[PDB]
Copies of this chain bind each other. A is one copy, B any other.
Amino acid sequence: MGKLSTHVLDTAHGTPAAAMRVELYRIAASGTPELLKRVVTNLDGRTDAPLLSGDEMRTGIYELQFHVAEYFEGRGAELAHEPFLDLIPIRFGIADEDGNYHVPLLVSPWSYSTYRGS
């Protein structure tokens, strides 16, 4: 049934963003983020398993956190001592536990974009 997935594209270089660290949180009632998963993007900028699947899918507010400065510094980027982008949180809601939520991230060290894809 339901599924959550992501796909990270490096727009500075025109490649998938491989070997990027990402964490998934569920934002609790209190507002406190509960860590669900730590993952790494594969060679195609995706994950080898869905972020959420089947019974894991629950309606609510979630947040993905992407380690973008780490990725770009590894790739050779020269960033400021305090980078403009370091950790990027993408906060979003899941309304349909049976829905397929695909959330791509396009990123450079000084810009990013995201959307509900398909």
Contact = CB atoms under 8 A, between A and B. Distances in A.
21 contacts: A59-B82, A61-B82, A80-B93, A80-B95, A80-B96, A81-B95, A82-B94, A83-B93, A84-B95, A85-B91, A85-B92, A85-B93, A86-B93, A87-B91, A88-B91, A89-B89, A89-B91, A106-B113, A110-B115, A111-B113, A111-B116
Contacts of A15: none
Q: How many copies does the complex hold?
A: 2
A74 interface: no
Contacts of A60: 82
Interface residues of A, number: 27
Interface of A: 59-61, 80-89, 91-96, 106, 110-116
Given A84-B93, A112-B115, 14 more contacts: A59-B82, A61-B82, A61-B86, A80-B93, A80-B96, A82-B93, A83-B93, A85-B93, A88-B91, A89-B89, A110-B115, A111-B114, A111-B115, A112-B113
